[PDB]
Amino acid sequence: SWRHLVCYLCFYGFMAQIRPGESFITPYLLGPDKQFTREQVTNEITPVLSYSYLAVLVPVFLLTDYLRYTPVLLLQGLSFVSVWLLLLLGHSVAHMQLMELFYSVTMAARIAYSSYIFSLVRPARYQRVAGYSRAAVLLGVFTSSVLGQLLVTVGRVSFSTLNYISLAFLTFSVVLALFLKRPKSVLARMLRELGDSLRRPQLRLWSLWWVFNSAGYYLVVYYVHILWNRVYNWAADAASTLLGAITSFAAGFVKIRWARWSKLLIAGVTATQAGLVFLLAHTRHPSSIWLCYAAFVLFRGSYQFLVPIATFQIASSLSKELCALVFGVNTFFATIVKTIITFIVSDVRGLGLPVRKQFQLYSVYFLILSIIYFLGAMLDGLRH
Ligand SMILES: Nc1ncnc2c1ncn2[C@@H]1O[C@@H]2CO[P@](=O)(S)O[C@@H]3[C@H](O)[C@@H](CO[P@](=O)(S)O[C@H]2[C@H]1O)O[C@H]3n1cnc2c(N)ncnc21
What we know:
By secondary structure, the chain is mainly alpha-helical. It folds into two domains: 1-184, Growth Hormone, Chain: A (Up-down Bundle), CATH 1.20.1250; 185-384, Growth Hormone, Chain: A, CATH 1.20.1250. The chain has helices at residues 7-16, 25-30, 40-43, 46-67, 70-89, 93-120, 126-154, 161-177, 186-197, 201-228, 231-253, 263-281, 289-317, 323-346, 355-380. α4 runs antiparallel to α14 (323-346), α10 (201-228) packs across α14 and α11 runs parallel beside α13. The N and C termini lie far apart (45 Å). Ligand GJF binds at residues 49-50, 53, 107, 218, 221-222, 225, 335, 338. Keywords: Acetylation, Antiport, Cell membrane, Disease variant, Folate-binding, Glycoprotein, Hereditary hemolytic anemia, Membrane, Phosphoprotein, Transmembrane, Transmembrane helix, Transport. Residues 65-68, 117-130, 255-260, 312-325 are cytoplasmic. This is Reduced folate transporter. The chain crosses the membrane at residues 7-27, 42-64, 69-89, 94-116, 131-155, 161-179, 203-228, 232-254, 261-281, 288-311, 326-349, 358-382.
């Protein structure tokens, strides 16, 4: 088991996030194969996915740590297979709502796999394993996106044959997941553990970083595609994913003194993200779109550089074997913050503003987050 703890785990992550037909779900639901209603794919499947994400995350993060991370990893593949079987069979919109529910089910085994790595390896290579696995995950996402875009734009095969390839790769991912080794008032136990671990400085900082910076990252990523909506969009996404994989690898390889040079790093990367968001918002010249794409890929790399470090620091600082619960509560809070900000600002009944203004307030949001982190770094060090 000298390779099947890191090398095989990273290979499984790479093979699990290979779904060439995942980005083409909406066109497939709109093409001649499975002709649907334009409003149905908007008011019937997107809302059910959005609500079921939280409704499924709530028990997943509670149960994955107790289940020892193997059942949830297998359930990810089984639910992806169910999603694609529903996509292939199709039938009525009830099947599509079931497909979106199963997709929301898959969305939380992300946190399951993220917490698996630190329960697989010893608490001395957490950073190098977090970087390896995040790099493998982002490489898998990039390979899936490239595979899909190459098959449709170049190979022009179909939206069904691409889905068959996706089904084959998902079944192989399930086969791989079956061979992963299983690590060896519970509600009150978890509540007491969280109450005791919140007081730690390294868990609290990276927990408050996850629930806010990631929520800002989701908001920017979602609103970039709204602004974008083209070959120069999927290409930008693939470049951003490759840069994210490379930066996750670097984070798994970087060796600095943490708990002293940590809040400064967070503040610096957040300020860089705020600058890139400002550049994205304040650039509309016709001969400047490549600069916008470069800003997007740099923002994605900046965010994905900290995710392995955040996971390693949340796992290392924990004194109990339930890193899955902390990862899940952070992801749940990030999604809740994103939903709250969208409802408060983006809603028509709320302070409804165009996409450019949306990026202006998100630029100032990243700015104030960076300012708060820099102020924390200037107030903790001043109390040396
Ligand atoms: N084709 C599209 N055009 C424009 N915007 C889109 C979009 N597909 C999604 N988004 C949006 O991007 C935001 C960030 O996405 P990611 O950060 S790049 O990944 C998200 C995130 O991990 C999670 C919660 O993030 P979330 O708060 S619910 O918001 C998402 C999502 O609504 O949902 C994941 N996710 C992955 N694939 C899908 C999908 N097919 N549908 C909905 N969510 C999806």
